[PDB]
Design a protein around this motif. Structure first.
Motif, PDB file in Angstrom:
ATOM      1  N   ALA A  62      58.405  21.533  40.684  1.00 31.65           N
ATOM      2  CA  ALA A  62      57.461  21.747  39.600  1.00 31.65           C
ATOM      3  C   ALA A  62      57.510  20.542  38.677  1.00 31.65           C
ATOM      4  O   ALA A  62      58.595  20.073  38.323  1.00 31.65           O
ATOM      5  CB  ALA A  62      57.789  23.027  38.831  1.00 31.65           C
ATOM      6  N   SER A  73      51.571  17.883  29.445  1.00 32.46           N
ATOM      7  CA  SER A  73      51.339  18.385  28.092  1.00 32.46           C
ATOM      8  C   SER A  73      49.969  19.062  27.952  1.00 32.46           C
ATOM      9  O   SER A  73      49.145  18.948  28.869  1.00 32.46           O
ATOM     10  CB  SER A  73      51.518  17.218  27.122  1.00 32.46           C
ATOM     11  OG  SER A  73      52.855  16.755  27.181  1.00 32.46           O
ATOM     12  N   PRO A  74      49.684  19.764  26.844  1.00 32.33           N
ATOM     13  CA  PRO A  74      48.457  20.589  26.762  1.00 32.33           C
ATOM     14  C   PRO A  74      47.181  19.859  27.160  1.00 32.33           C
ATOM     15  O   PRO A  74      46.788  18.870  26.539  1.00 32.33           O
ATOM     16  CB  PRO A  74      48.425  21.006  25.289  1.00 32.33           C
ATOM     17  CG  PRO A  74      49.854  21.137  24.937  1.00 32.33           C
ATOM     18  CD  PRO A  74      50.597  20.071  25.725  1.00 32.33           C
ATOM     19  N   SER A 124      60.602  18.858  36.782  1.00 30.48           N
ATOM     20  CA  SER A 124      60.713  17.504  36.264  1.00 30.48           C
ATOM     21  C   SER A 124      59.659  17.259  35.197  1.00 30.48           C
ATOM     22  O   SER A 124      58.478  17.544  35.409  1.00 30.48           O
ATOM     23  CB  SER A 124      60.565  16.479  37.385  1.00 30.48           C
ATOM     24  OG  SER A 124      59.312  16.617  38.023  1.00 30.48           O
ATOM     25  N   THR A 125      60.091  16.735  34.058  1.00 29.36           N
ATOM     26  CA  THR A 125      59.202  16.191  33.045  1.00 29.36           C
ATOM     27  C   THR A 125      59.428  14.691  32.973  1.00 29.36           C
ATOM     28  O   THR A 125      60.258  14.132  33.694  1.00 29.36           O
ATOM     29  CB  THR A 125      59.444  16.827  31.674  1.00 29.36           C
ATOM     30  OG1 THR A 125      60.543  16.170  31.032  1.00 29.36           O
ATOM     31  CG2 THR A 125      59.769  18.299  31.823  1.00 29.36           C
ATOM     32  N   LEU A 182      45.928  13.080  32.806  1.00 29.19           N
ATOM     33  CA  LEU A 182      47.105  12.941  31.955  1.00 29.19           C
ATOM     34  C   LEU A 182      48.003  11.804  32.419  1.00 29.19           C
ATOM     35  O   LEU A 182      48.629  11.127  31.592  1.00 29.19           O
ATOM     36  CB  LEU A 182      47.877  14.252  31.900  1.00 29.19           C
ATOM     37  CG  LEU A 182      47.350  15.202  30.829  1.00 29.19           C
ATOM     38  CD1 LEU A 182      48.472  16.084  30.329  1.00 29.19           C
ATOM     39  CD2 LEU A 182      46.692  14.444  29.677  1.00 29.19           C
ATOM     40  N   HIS A 239      48.961   8.797  29.846  1.00 25.39           N
ATOM     41  CA  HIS A 239      50.293   8.289  29.545  1.00 25.39           C
ATOM     42  C   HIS A 239      50.408   6.813  29.902  1.00 25.39           C
ATOM     43  O   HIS A 239      51.032   6.037  29.171  1.00 25.39           O
ATOM     44  CB  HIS A 239      51.352   9.104  30.277  1.00 25.39           C
ATOM     45  CG  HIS A 239      51.694  10.395  29.603  1.00 25.39           C
ATOM     46  ND1 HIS A 239      51.073  11.583  29.912  1.00 25.39           N
ATOM     47  CD2 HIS A 239      52.597  10.682  28.637  1.00 25.39           C
ATOM     48  CE1 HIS A 239      51.579  12.549  29.167  1.00 25.39           C
ATOM     49  NE2 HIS A 239      52.506  12.028  28.385  1.00 25.39           N
ATOM     50  N   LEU A 263      54.677  10.929  36.798  1.00 24.10           N
ATOM     51  CA  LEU A 263      55.540  11.950  37.372  1.00 24.10           C
ATOM     52  C   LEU A 263      55.449  11.999  38.886  1.00 24.10           C
ATOM     53  O   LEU A 263      56.287  12.648  39.520  1.00 24.10           O
ATOM     54  CB  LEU A 263      55.197  13.320  36.796  1.00 24.10           C
ATOM     55  CG  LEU A 263      55.670  13.537  35.364  1.00 24.10           C
ATOM     56  CD1 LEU A 263      55.247  14.901  34.855  1.00 24.10           C
ATOM     57  CD2 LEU A 263      57.177  13.375  35.292  1.00 24.10           C
ATOM     58  N   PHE A 290      45.684  18.028  22.310  1.00 21.96           N
ATOM     59  CA  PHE A 290      46.762  17.568  23.177  1.00 21.96           C
ATOM     60  C   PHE A 290      47.927  17.143  22.296  1.00 21.96           C
ATOM     61  O   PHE A 290      47.835  16.144  21.578  1.00 21.96           O
ATOM     62  CB  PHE A 290      46.276  16.411  24.050  1.00 21.96           C
ATOM     63  CG  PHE A 290      47.363  15.712  24.817  1.00 21.96           C
ATOM     64  CD1 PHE A 290      48.053  14.648  24.264  1.00 21.96           C
ATOM     65  CD2 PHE A 290      47.663  16.097  26.106  1.00 21.96           C
ATOM     66  CE1 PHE A 290      49.042  14.001  24.976  1.00 21.96           C
ATOM     67  CE2 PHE A 290      48.644  15.455  26.822  1.00 21.96           C
ATOM     68  CZ  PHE A 290      49.337  14.405  26.258  1.00 21.96           C
ATOM     69  N   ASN A 291      49.014  17.906  22.334  1.00 25.09           N
ATOM     70  CA  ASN A 291      50.214  17.589  21.569  1.00 25.09           C
ATOM     71  C   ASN A 291      51.362  17.399  22.546  1.00 25.09           C
ATOM     72  O   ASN A 291      51.857  18.369  23.129  1.00 25.09           O
ATOM     73  CB  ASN A 291      50.530  18.682  20.550  1.00 25.09           C
ATOM     74  CG  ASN A 291      51.670  18.304  19.624  1.00 25.09           C
ATOM     75  OD1 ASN A 291      52.034  17.134  19.512  1.00 25.09           O
ATOM     76  ND2 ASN A 291      52.241  19.298  18.954  1.00 25.09           N
ATOM     77  N   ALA A 292      51.783  16.151  22.714  1.00 24.85           N
ATOM     78  CA  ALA A 292      52.916  15.800  23.556  1.00 24.85           C
ATOM     79  C   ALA A 292      53.963  15.155  22.669  1.00 24.85           C
ATOM     80  O   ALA A 292      53.659  14.205  21.940  1.00 24.85           O
ATOM     81  CB  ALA A 292      52.508  14.847  24.682  1.00 24.85           C
ATOM     82  N   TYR A 340      57.915  13.577  22.756  1.00 25.12           N
ATOM     83  CA  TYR A 340      59.086  13.144  23.497  1.00 25.12           C
ATOM     84  C   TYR A 340      60.137  12.640  22.517  1.00 25.12           C
ATOM     85  O   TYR A 340      59.877  12.496  21.318  1.00 25.12           O
ATOM     86  CB  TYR A 340      58.734  12.057  24.518  1.00 25.12           C
ATOM     87  CG  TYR A 340      57.650  12.443  25.504  1.00 25.12           C
ATOM     88  CD1 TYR A 340      57.952  13.119  26.678  1.00 25.12           C
ATOM     89  CD2 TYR A 340      56.324  12.112  25.267  1.00 25.12           C
ATOM     90  CE1 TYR A 340      56.959  13.462  27.582  1.00 25.12           C
ATOM     91  CE2 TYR A 340      55.330  12.449  26.162  1.00 25.12           C
ATOM     92  CZ  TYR A 340      55.650  13.122  27.317  1.00 25.12           C
ATOM     93  OH  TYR A 340      54.653  13.455  28.202  1.00 25.12           O
TER      94      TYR A 340
END
Lengths: 418, 99, 29, 23, 418
Positions: free
Chosen positions: C15, C19-20, E79-80, E139, E143, E155, E291-293, E295
């Motif tokens: 997985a 983000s949103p 995984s992020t 996305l 990034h 990713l 969109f709120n990311a 880190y």
């Protein structure tokens, strides 16, 4: 003899030069290309370029190819972003048949569904072959990141459009761009009246001044491609002046001052200042040359750098520093005259060949609408003053930058960093 | 003692004469095929060239020159670890199948 | 709506989470 | 003069060609 | 029982909550991911995520798969960009076996050449499956455009690196990034002493911080895909606060103020300000969210829009204008309170499920060391003032912005225009 430049009322240029060569060459320079496209029809020009031998209204594909080979002739389609030229070349005696075939191909395109679906596959093969050398991809990304429209369009059909170009799209493109006013029939080795006769025989039907695209706008983005090849091909450019302006000539002189493609095999390009400037900083294998693309509405001037991934940043910075130094005013008149000599020689050697002369006359007719004698071109070249070159350098240095780099980017800097 | 008779068999068997090594002459069952496909490329290419040269020699009914024969000590069992691992994995799969 | 691009799995479920990213009412519209 | 990328593929009776700008 | 947090001398963090539930979930959270990949080893994190079942020193691939399946357990790798989480879930009676398998996978991988070569195709299969939804690619490009460094890494493995990932690279990544100071072993339904014993048993080796990634640097770029999809997915973001900061909570409240996700199925997102603001302008199928990311080093905040290709510009402009209106001070206290309630409820609902609770505990342990009770998180949410939300909106509007767009993109605005 001399060039018989003439304009029919419809707006079609017919130029002929009877060089009395054993073989003649006729080319219809249609003002079409990737520029005259939109998002919906992206890649259509590529298929049009590939659809040279498709069955036309008068001649079948079999007939076209068999006849052209039987006379030993050749049909080639050269498509720049702004000009798509269809050229036929064969011996003088059999020139009429290839003339008929060419005008059949251009005037009456019968895009049968099955044939177009067949060539859709060949699209991918041609793009793959073109992209074997990284420079092609790098330049495509450069043009994409430099402009927001028109010139940003690529000369190779995008992947999502590879198998999705429709016959209707080809028909629409031909109808709205392959127009008489946007056409220019230039033929070397043929008489003027024959050229006029054929041009009025086929190209007349399409009314001129077809659908016209919008002027490109300088995006100034940075497209970075990470492909993993050790050598990093990077090109940092800024909007120069469009072709036909005096600043364009100044930019060409600037390109030669900085350094263009080598004049000595396995040479260190001693005259080329970019090479020395980078070499004093980068002792690793490298190759830096001046990129000067000049289109009808806008131009791009910049520096193309090929070097190792770790040392790419050093190469780019050193070359940019050399250009900055030139912009500062550290320009020697001896170098100015030497670059002018190089430009004049390059132009004359380019127009030396039959193909070179044909493309030059076609371009001049298509954009300017008249033939400029080489002597006048050389006079324009020397007319450029040193101040003009320094000012072009200033325009590049203090200008918004669009960079495209391909390779193991890594150390490769960013437009903000440069 | 035992090394004497083993060395005798090594000379008696002709795979040293053809320039082959012991693991080259093993019968290629499924375990051997998996072991071969697990070989590093250098070992694999060496193996295929050795076997090709041996087949060529046998074709013309000739033998390699005496100095070029493989040595009993110099013979290296390249395939033994990989084949043992394959056999062990097969044994584990069989054991799980048993119960 | 992160919409973590999950992959169906048993005994190995990779997985990856972002983000949103919206995609909230596209079916509704 | 640095090569307008001159990427024309070879061919007979149908040979497409493309060019971009100096390299 | 209550959650028990222990920081071991080697730096590992062990947490356990005995929920007295039929199922027990054990998760090892490691501070590794795409961020800690350099250019040379891009995509190694992806294959490492896939290579959770390969042969280990303790057990073979067959034994791991068969045993985990036999007890009915599940082994999952999440995984992020900044984190990788290995979790095993099964009945409490058989948790020891899966714990042994988990630590064998995490601490003693073999990465045998044949198994990695076989698994390399799963890289492409997984990438294709993930990229079926356009959101993933959008996305990824967002990034890549926003950051020039660590956080830009995808990713998913880049296409040119699909077959080029080497076992040595996997070993290097594990050795330098899977370390005790970077790991946290989180357990639900498992007593603390047992987890501690297992941590000493396997995670004793490879201590220390390990290799440290460079700080992410904002790039402020744009990437436009032009994939020809009917609807256009466009995301416009600006740099924001790092996770666990006051401004981060302010940005979360701002996201909920603008509109994050519909709460009523097939609803109109009445509370969502962006939704209504766009809806009044555009009557076509559309979508918009915030969109709120966040880190550890930095964060991104912005708007994600999905709309008809023709109307993409209108939607993006309307959402941007609504954010501008919030920034100018047109923010009611009631809206702030409603957003605070929505965010607090979202946090509670997220930690409601066992998977959510384990993930939250692991994330807090890795990012901040200690575990903060839900009540304190809610108090932090309450502490945010309306002025903070206005200032967050002002920062987003004023800050340099990065945009990623995919679709037809004919009318999609460039970053400069917005």
């Amino acid at each position: 003899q001399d060039l018989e430049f003439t304009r029919l009322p419809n707006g079609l240029v017919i130029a002929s030069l009877e060089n009395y060569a054993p073989a003649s060459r006729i080319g219809l320079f249609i003002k079409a290309g990737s520029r005259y496209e939109d998002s919906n029809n992206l890649g259509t020009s590529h298929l049009l370029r590939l659809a040279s031998s498709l069955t036309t209204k008068g001649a079948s594909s079999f007939k076209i190819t068999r006849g052209i080979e039987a006379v030993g002739g050749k049909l080639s389609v050269t498509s720049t972003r702004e000009s798509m030229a269809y050229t036929v070349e064969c011996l003088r005696d059999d020139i009429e048949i290839l003339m008929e075939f060419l005008l059949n191909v251009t005037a009456a395109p019968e895009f049968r569904r099955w044939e177009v679906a067949a060539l859709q596959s060949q699209l991918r093969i041609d793009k793959a072959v073109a992209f074997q050398n990284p420079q092609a991809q790098v330049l495509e990304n450069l043009h994409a990141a430099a402009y927001r429209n028109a010139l940003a369009n690529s000369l190779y059909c995008p992947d999502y459009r590879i198998g999705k170009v429709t016959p209707d799209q080809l028909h629409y493109y031909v109808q709205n761009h392959f127009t008489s006013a946007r056409m220019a029939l230039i033929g070397l080795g043929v008489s003027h009246p024959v050229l006029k006769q054929v041009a009025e025989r086929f190209l007349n039907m399409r009314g001129g001044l077809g659908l016209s695209g919008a002027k490109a706008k300088y995006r100034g983005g940075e497209i970075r491609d990470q492909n993993g090849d050790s050598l990093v091909h990077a090109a940092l450019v800024a909007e120069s002046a469009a072709t036909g302006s005096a600043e364009a000539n100044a930019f060409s002189v600037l390109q030669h001052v900085l350094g263009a493609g080598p004049h000595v095999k396995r040479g260190s390009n001693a005259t080329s200042s970019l090479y020395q400037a980078v070499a004093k900083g980068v002792h690793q294998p490298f190759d830096v040359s001046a990129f000067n693309a000049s289109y009808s509405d806008s131009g791009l001037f910049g520096i193309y750098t090929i070097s190792q991934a770790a040392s790419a940043g050093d190469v780019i910075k050193s070359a940019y520093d050399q250009v900055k130094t030139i912009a500062q005013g550290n320009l020697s008149n001896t170098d100015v005259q030497a670059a002018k000599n190089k430009l004049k020689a390059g132009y004359l050697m380019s127009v030396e060949s039959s193909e070179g002369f044909l493309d030059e006359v076609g371009s001049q007719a298509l954009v300017a609408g008249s033939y400029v004698q080489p002597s006048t071109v050389l006079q324009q070249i020397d007319s450029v003053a040193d101040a003009d070159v320094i000012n072009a350098a200033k325009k590049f240095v203090s200008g918004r930058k669009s960079m495209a780099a391909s390779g193991n980017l890594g150390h490769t800097p960013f437009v903000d960093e440069l | 003692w035992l090394e004497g008779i083993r060395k005798w068999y090594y000379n008696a068997a002709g795979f040293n004469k053809l320039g082959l090594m012991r693991d080259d002459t093993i019968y290629e069952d499924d375990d051997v095929k998996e072991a071969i496909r697990r070989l590093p490329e250098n070992l694999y290419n060496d193996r295929v060239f050795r076997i090709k040269r041996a087949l060529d020699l046998t074709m013309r009914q000739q033998i390699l020159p005496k100095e070029q024969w493989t040595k009993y000590e110099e013979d290296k069992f390249y395939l033994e670890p990989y084949l043992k691992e394959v056999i062990r994995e097969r044994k584990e799969r069989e054991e799980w199948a048993k119960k | 709506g992160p919409f973590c691009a999950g992959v169906v799995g048993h005994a190995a479920l990779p997985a990856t989470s972002e983000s949103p990213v919206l995609d909230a009412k596209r079916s509704f519209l």
